[PDB]
Design an enzyme around this catalytic site. Structure first.
Site, PDB file in Angstrom:
ATOM      1  N   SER A 190      -2.910  -1.187 -52.719  1.00  0.00           N
ATOM      2  CA  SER A 190      -3.465  -0.203 -51.588  1.00  0.00           C
ATOM      3  C   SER A 190      -2.112   0.601 -51.375  1.00  0.00           C
ATOM      4  CB  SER A 190      -3.300  -1.317 -50.592  1.00  0.00           C
ATOM      5  OG  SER A 190      -4.134  -2.384 -50.237  1.00  0.00           O
ATOM      6  N   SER A 216      -3.228  -6.783 -56.674  1.00  0.00           N
ATOM      7  CA  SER A 216      -3.844  -6.419 -55.284  1.00  0.00           C
ATOM      8  C   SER A 216      -4.684  -6.476 -54.497  1.00  0.00           C
ATOM      9  CB  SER A 216      -2.202  -6.128 -54.417  1.00  0.00           C
ATOM     10  OG  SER A 216      -1.937  -7.412 -53.627  1.00  0.00           O
ATOM     11  N   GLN A 217      -4.878  -5.397 -53.835  1.00  0.00           N
ATOM     12  CA  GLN A 217      -6.268  -5.081 -53.553  1.00  0.00           C
ATOM     13  C   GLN A 217      -7.230  -4.805 -55.139  1.00  0.00           C
ATOM     14  OE1 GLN A 217      -9.679  -2.544 -51.394  1.00  0.00           O
ATOM     15  NE2 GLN A 217      -7.369  -2.551 -50.874  1.00  0.00           N
ATOM     16  N   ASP A 256       4.659 -14.262 -52.713  1.00  0.00           N
ATOM     17  CA  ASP A 256       4.239 -12.708 -52.768  1.00  0.00           C
ATOM     18  C   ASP A 256       2.778 -13.088 -51.558  1.00  0.00           C
ATOM     19  OD1 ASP A 256       1.722 -10.836 -54.996  1.00  0.00           O
ATOM     20  OD2 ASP A 256       1.741 -11.147 -53.001  1.00  0.00           O
ATOM     21  N   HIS A 267       8.999  -5.058 -51.858  1.00  0.00           N
ATOM     22  CA  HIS A 267       9.500  -5.366 -52.873  1.00  0.00           C
ATOM     23  C   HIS A 267       8.137  -5.431 -53.748  1.00  0.00           C
ATOM     24  CE1 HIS A 267      13.431  -3.711 -52.118  1.00  0.00           C
ATOM     25  NE2 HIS A 267      13.647  -4.736 -51.809  1.00  0.00           N
TER      26      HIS A 267
END
Length: 194
Positions: A27, A106-107, A161, A174
């Site tokens: 994202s 991520s996404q 995370d 970060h």
């Protein structure tokens, strides 16, 4: 800019590489490759294989990598998923003998896990290795891509995370996967190729 790569789209079947690499950005990242984990794995693949023997491709088009979509059930928009399936299929159409390797951050891991899970046995078979940095569906999917072998799947989930724990925190942080992407993931992909 490293951040947009289209080597598969502009690829022709008379100059296939050994390696087609497709990546989904996190994202907010610009382009189709982003500016973190994307270009890192891509820089290493070319370094190992040659620039001429790797087609580097981001998931662009309808994949907007916007924060709202993390909250859809599959953790991203279905038009993001169909765009990845589309590119995976194109790599197969154009170059059925090249090793496809893929990445997501991520996404973008949800784009991979979404698209990859629904593919024809033939294509999943050409995808030699998948590297997921910060898998947002690690909890829910049980740290694998559904319908796609764990031996070709390497998941990187830092303790810090939040998204690896089955939820979503959204706040500036970060990048966590610096050494993973530069070292371990190329290494893992190099063993799979192919």
């Amino acid at each position: 800019q490293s951040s947009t790569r289209n080597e598969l789209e502009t690829g022709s079947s008379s100059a296939c590489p050994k390696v087609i690499y497709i990546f989904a950005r996190a994202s907010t990242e610009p382009g189709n490759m982003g500016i973190s984990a994307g270009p890192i794995v891509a820089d290493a693949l070319e370094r190992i294989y040659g620039a001429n023997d790797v087609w580097v491709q981001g998931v662009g088009g309808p994949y907007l990598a916007d924060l709202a979509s993390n909250f859809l059930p599959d953790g991203t928009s279905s038009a993001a998923i169909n765009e990845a399936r589309r590119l995976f299929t194109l790599a197969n159409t154009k170059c059925p003998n090249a090793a496809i390797v893929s990445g997501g951050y991520s996404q973008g891991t949800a784009v991979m896990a979404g698209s990859i899970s629904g593919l024809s046995t033939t294509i999943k078979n050409q995808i030699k290795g998948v590297v997921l940095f910060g898998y947002t569906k690690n909890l829910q999917n049980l740290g694998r891509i559904p319908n796609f072998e764990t031996s070709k799947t390497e998941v990187y989930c830092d303790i810090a995370d939040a998204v690896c724990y089955g939820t979503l925190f959204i706040l500036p942080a970060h990048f966590l996967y610096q050494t993973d992407a530069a070292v371990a993931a190329p290494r893992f992909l190099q063993a799979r190729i192919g």
